[PDB]
Design a protein around this ligand. Sequence first.
Ligand SMILES: CCC(O)(O)CCCCC[C@H](NC(=O)[C@H]1CC12CCN(C)CC2)c1nc(-c2ccc3c(c2)[C@H]2CC[C@@H]3C2)c[nH]1
Ligand SMILES: [Ca+2]
Ligand SMILES: [Ca+2]
Ligand SMILES: [Zn+2]
Length: 368
Amino acid sequence: GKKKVCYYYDGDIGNYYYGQGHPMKPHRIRMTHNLLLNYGLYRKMEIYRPHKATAEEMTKYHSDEYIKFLRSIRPDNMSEYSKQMQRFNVGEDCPVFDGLFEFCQLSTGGSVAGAVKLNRQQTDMAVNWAGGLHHAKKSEASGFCYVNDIVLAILELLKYHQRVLYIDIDIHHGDGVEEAFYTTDRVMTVSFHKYGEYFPGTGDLRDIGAGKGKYYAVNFPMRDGIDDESYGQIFKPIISKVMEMYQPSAVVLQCGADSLSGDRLGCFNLTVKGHAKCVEVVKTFNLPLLMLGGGGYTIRNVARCWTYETAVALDCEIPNELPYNDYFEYFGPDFKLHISPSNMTNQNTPEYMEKIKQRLFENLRMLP
Ligand SMILES: CCC(O)(O)CCCCC[C@H](NC(=O)[C@H]1CC12CCN(C)CC2)c1nc(-c2ccc3c(c2)[C@H]2CC[C@@H]3C2)c[nH]1
Ligand SMILES: [Ca+2]
Ligand SMILES: [Ca+2]
Ligand SMILES: [Zn+2]
């Protein structure tokens, strides 16, 4: 039936600024929060302010030298760290900005706190829209991500769950999470992403894991223009087969909204309903679930998407007419919650979708 939902948010998160021209805008998290507050979604959720994750909590995965660097670097002392900046890939995509470490602490704190709440059986679902920073590596920042809150949250869930399923619907391949668990069978990673002349360049359908992790990494490479019909046609059958074969006891779902139509960096054509159908599919399995944010660069659509996915988690119907809110003008000219797909061509033919699904089904037959 209806599930208990715990939501993590710090009111300071929207003030972190990556810099002029940078597509990553933490302000979209504040827009999401304000929109869901104005729809009355706080009446049914337990809202928590995450703690600031310590350097020590982050080193359960990341190297001590990398976390020490993140805790020390600032725009005013950058000149003295040119060597470490190159070593840790801090530069254009992952810039040094005021409060960088505190931003990482809040993003991570929400994910780890949600995982602890799930481990204690005190909630059915935990939501952290500030998390889902899937590209960060053990000793390297990557693709706007510095600390991999997902890996840290999964490590927390592994304290009480033998098998954890990670599902990533961001348009970009979830490389940092896949790499962290590539040689283990205790985590199965499933990523649906655009593949071909696109960041980060990984996630080929032939990348299936290694050693004890062979067959525990699943990648569904897609081309431009995927729509609700095509995505829905493969998501439920793949996830149903993964649930059947792997039998996870907890799930983490990365809900990156850059797979929506009209995204500044993405080239997919999903609507908010099509994207949210993934949340509905996962929720139906009735397993402890951690829902996280991720990409999303047309910020009015990210706020619409995550507001609707929070309503989905709560089993609460909300009207298409947007309520008045602090950012009302950002939702013009329509002031509606749902979006329309564009006229872009879907390069993923129905035959391509079925063929890739069949190759993934062959790999899933190899599980014990
Ligand atoms: C949160 C999860 C997630 O998955 O959604 C994260 C997605 C990350 C996409 C990263 C991608 N980077 C790249 O494609 C890497 C090969 C480069 C090209 C761009 N230059 C600056 C660095 C080297 C990329 N970077 C940009 C980008 C656009 C505009 C700018 C920048 C990056 C910086 C330099 C100018 C401004 C700031 C676009 N695409
Ligand atoms: Ca993905
Ligand atoms: Ca794995
Ligand atoms: Zn992305």
